[PDB]
Amino acid sequence: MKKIAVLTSGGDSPGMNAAVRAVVRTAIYNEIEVYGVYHGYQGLLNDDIHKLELGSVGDTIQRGGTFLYSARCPEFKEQEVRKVAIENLRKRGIEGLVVIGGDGSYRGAQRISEECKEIQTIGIPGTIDNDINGTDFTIGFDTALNTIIGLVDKIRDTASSHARTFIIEAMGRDCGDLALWAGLSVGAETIVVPEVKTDIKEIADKIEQGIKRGKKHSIVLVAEGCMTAQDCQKELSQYINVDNRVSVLGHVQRGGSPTGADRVLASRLGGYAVDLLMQGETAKGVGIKNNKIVATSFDEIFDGKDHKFDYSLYELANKLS
């Protein structure tokens, strides 16, 4: 395991830089040469691959986004296109590839492993969505969660006296976890998520209570995968009067410095990915499951497509509201 490459792919998540830092520093500590691949899979295709030194990752643990960049590379779904990527790594004697991103990003690594025996691939879960098999949490979830809390605080601090209701669109893609944790965290009366059948009427009866009971600043937190904040507002206005504050939180949820949880998590998983390459492993995603650092085959990641939504926690949040 003489040389490894590392790349970041998909949307930004806080702690991607901390994961690259840990890959680079662990590899060099073990006398392995490490190459940064810039712009995700497009970088592999364009040969935008450069040797990293210890100082290349100075001042990065705190840095949001990804200093290697990321780009979309739809053409990487083509087998013939991947041959070009494989040859650019092989050219350089690279024996290991670490991909930091979401499950989409993992598919690319799985293909590279199937199509080149000589390259070992390991996935690191960098995404704010928390929707990757075999890890309880993804690198960015904790940071995203706190970003939502701060945004909701800013909204409330800047709102008018008439604001009876704030409808806040959180990210998540198809997973309700972010909306649920953020919702609980901000004391939301309602949390709208894809895993629970939304009862608009029930929700409207709940706003009209707080209001009738002379209560201000009620929060509806909405996962983008269920519906848009706008849509939620339009649907509630079928029953009750509202256009309070429809706030689409948007891409800021991916920005900002990672939290300490993300820094630590990223770091452990980046070092473990390198340990796994040195151990001869391939075609695995790393994670934290039941408080243990573990590796799961991409097959299992993508087959069992089951990481439980916590209905008990959803019901607690409602209980608390």
Ligand X SMILES: Nc1ncnc2c1ncn2[C@@H]1O[C@H](COP(=O)(O)OP(=O)(O)OP(=O)(O)O)[C@@H](O)[C@H]1O
The string of DSSP letters for 25-78 reads HHHHHTT-EEEEEPSHHHHHHTT-EEEE-GGGGTT-TT--S-SS-----GGGGS
List the one residue from 13, 130, 247, 267 that touches its own copies (CB under 8 A): 267
Q: How far is the CB of 47 from its own copies (least distance, A)?
A: 29
| Residues within the interface to ligand X (CB under 6 A) | 9-11, 41, 72-74, 76-77, 101-105, 107-108, 111, 127, 129, 173
Count other C-beta atoms under 10 Å from residue 97's C-beta.
Answer: 27
**Is position 172 annotated in a ligand binding site?**
yes
When asked if residue 162 is in the footprint of its own copies (CB under 8 A), the reply is no
**Is position 31 annotated in a ligand binding site?**
no
CA 180 to CA 233: how far, in whole Å?
19
CA 71 to CA 43: how far, in whole Å?
8
When asked if residue 52 is in the footprint of its own copies (CB under 8 A), the reply is no
47 touches 287 (CB < 8 A)? no
CA 136 to CA 20: how far, in whole Å?
21
- Point out which span in 68-76, 97-105, 139-147, 200-208 binds its own copies (CB under 8 A): 139-147
Count of helix runs (H) and strand runs (E) in the chain: 11, 12
Closest to its own copies by CB, 99 vs 145, is 145
The residue number with the shortest CB distance to ligand X is 104
Residue 299 half-sphere exposure toward CB, CA atoms < 13 A: 4
- Point out which span in 20-28, 125-133, 201-209, 222-230 binds its own copies (CB under 8 A): 20-28
Could you say which of 12, 48, 59, 129 is catalytic?
Answer: 129
Closest to ligand X by CB, 100 vs 317, is 100
Q: Does the active-site annotation cover 129?
A: yes
CA 105 to CA 112: how far, in whole Å?
11
When asked if residue 146 is in the footprint of its own copies (CB under 8 A), the reply is yes
Sign of the Cα pseudo-torsion (193, 196, 198, 199, in order): negative
**Is position 24 annotated in a ligand binding site?**
yes
Q: Read off the tokens for 281.
A: 């492993």
225 touches 174 (CB < 8 A)? yes
Q: What is the binding site for its own copies (CB under 8 A)?
A: 21-22, 25-26, 29, 61-62, 136, 142, 145-146, 148-149, 153, 181-182, 184-187, 259-261, 263-264, 267-268, 271, 289-292, 313, 316-317, 319-320
Binding-site residue set: 11, 21-25, 72-73, 102-105, 127-129, 156, 164, 171-173, 187-189, 213, 215-217, 224, 245, 251-254
Binding-site residue set for Mg(2+): 103
Binding-site residue set for ATP: 11, 72-73, 102-105
Residues marked as catalytic: 129
